[PDB]
């Protein structure tokens, strides 16, 4: 099962960190639950910061897309 994190994150499947905390930045900033505009940030945030340590780890990433793309 694969968290989309890149969703999550609202990001791109297939990007980097660049993108991914731009994502998770912007996410994150729009997640932190001290400040988030979501259904539920401080999952989804911490989906997004889970999502960026995968995004922003390149053993979580790479897990991450190990299940996702790069099943």
Same mark, same amino acid.
């Given at each position: 099962?694969? *968290? =989309?994190?890149? +969703?999550? @994150?609202?990001? $791109? #499947?297939? =990007? !980097?960190? $660049?993108?991914? *905390?731009? &994502?998770?930045?912007?996410? +994150?900033? $729009?997640? %932190? #639950? !001290? /400040?988030? *505009?979501? #259904? !539920?940030?401080?999952?989804?945030? $911490?989906? /997004?910061?889970?999502?960026?340590? /995968?995004?922003? =780890?390149?053993?979580?990433? &790479?897990?991450? =897309?190990? @299940?996702?793309? %790069?099943?």
């Amino acid at each position: 099962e694969l *968290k =989309d994190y890149y +969703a999550i @994150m609202g990001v $791109k #499947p297939t =990007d !980097d960190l $660049k993108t991914i *905390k731009t &994502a998770y930045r912007r996410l +994150a900033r $729009k997640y %932190h #639950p !001290d /400040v988030s *505009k979501e #259904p !539920d940030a401080e999952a989804r945030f $911490k989906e /997004v910061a889970e999502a960026w340590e /995968v995004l922003s =780890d390149e053993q979580r990433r &790479a897990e991450y =897309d190990q @299940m996702w793309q %790069h099943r």
